């Protein structure tokens, strides 16, 4: 269980940062 929790939390942090970066690049490209 805890192994799944660690993997999922790492992937969630990465995905959150990546999604915000995608939004920022999206706004830059809009400009």
């Amino acid at each position: 269980r805890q192994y799944y929790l660690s993997k999922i939390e790492e992937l969630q942090l990465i995905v959150n940062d990546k999604s915000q970066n995608l939004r920022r690049l999206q706004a830059q490209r809009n400009e």
Binding site: R1, K7, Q12, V15, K18, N21, L22, L25, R29
Partner: protein
């Protein structure tokens, strides 16, 4: 549950990577 969550997160990460590459390439083309 946990396995489905893990693989869905992996798929989301890959999709975000492809989206980021697309955005970078389109930004370069827009600069040109």
């Amino acid at each position: 549950d946990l396995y489905s969550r893990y693989k869905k997160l992996q798929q989301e990460l890959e999709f975000l990577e492809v989206q980021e590459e697309y955005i970078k390439d389109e930004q370069k083309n827009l600069k040109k």
